[PDB]
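Q: What does the assembled structure look like for these inputs?
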Amino acid sequence: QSQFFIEHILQILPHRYPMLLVDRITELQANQKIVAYKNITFNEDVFNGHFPNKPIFPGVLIVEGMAQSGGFLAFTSLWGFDPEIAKTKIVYFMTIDKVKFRIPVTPGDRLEYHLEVLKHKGMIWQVGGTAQVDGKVVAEAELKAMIAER
Amino acid sequence: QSQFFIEHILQILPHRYPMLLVDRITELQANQKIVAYKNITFNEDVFNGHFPNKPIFPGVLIVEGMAQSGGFLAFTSLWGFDPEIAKTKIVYFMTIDKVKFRIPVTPGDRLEYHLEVLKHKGMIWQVGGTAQVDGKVVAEAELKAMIAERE
Amino acid sequence: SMGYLMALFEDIQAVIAEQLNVDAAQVTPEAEFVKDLGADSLDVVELIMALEEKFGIEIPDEQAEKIVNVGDVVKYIEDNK
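A:
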């Protein structure tokens, strides 16, 4: 498929509340790219702490959101939408590079992740791309992963 | 001062629950370096979601902890332990680089943050270093932050 | 001496190019970092520090803020050599 909803994400990714930071996948070109997003609302526990009277979505969770996207790509690019073997595989990220934060992300924002497969030698996945709000780029990051045995 | 406890950290960092990820500062050298740590326990909300039946502290929260430690260093380097002038800036995370995760961190671990100043000019701070558990490196990162007027 | 300056400018060009992901051919003394070269606030900050490193100098924010085009930063580096 090419568009995935939270029901689907929940069957591939092992992450749960409060660490599942992808709501919906809108584009999935296997082995080349993915576009997904997370809605940012005030009604999230993280804004109790970051920061009082100034809700800002933490930069490190933007990166974790991109990574979770990248990991949804890697898994489908190599097994398709197969929940059954998802039960026995987890995409583990090992490195993070060239991370930049340009625009604060706040409640009301639709945080889009666009990740394109950079290289795929052997068993090392490398993805990179951006995070975006309303066309603009809020953050960028570049990551490497491998697919493991839960 | 060189050793700061949670009561001290609260007066300097604007972070609050569940995003305050430094418990204690064990070593501080102005404009040079800092050693702090966070205890990791099963009784943290993250582990509900990461992951059911297998608690693993998210690598990005290790980087966040390090950044927070770096932030504490930058502030007290420039203004000392000044809670009042603390309440006129928050600290902005600019870049992250050369992050490598080596060992998983789990409930029971004491997670130590070791940060050197790599460069600082005025208000921009670039620090790098490691995260350790029991004298072994579990993670590495470099990062850049700058100080901003808060809320 | 004239050839020194030219070679120096060629090195300043490479940093700006690399930093802002732009062709050297676009990095003229006229080119403005924001308007022509597409640099935001973080880009400019990382650029200054990158130039500071590369040519081993320092620039105080009172005079770092005056610069708009690459020629400004070139003339700056030439003075503090």
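The interface with chain C takes residues 100-102 of chain A (CB under 8 Å).
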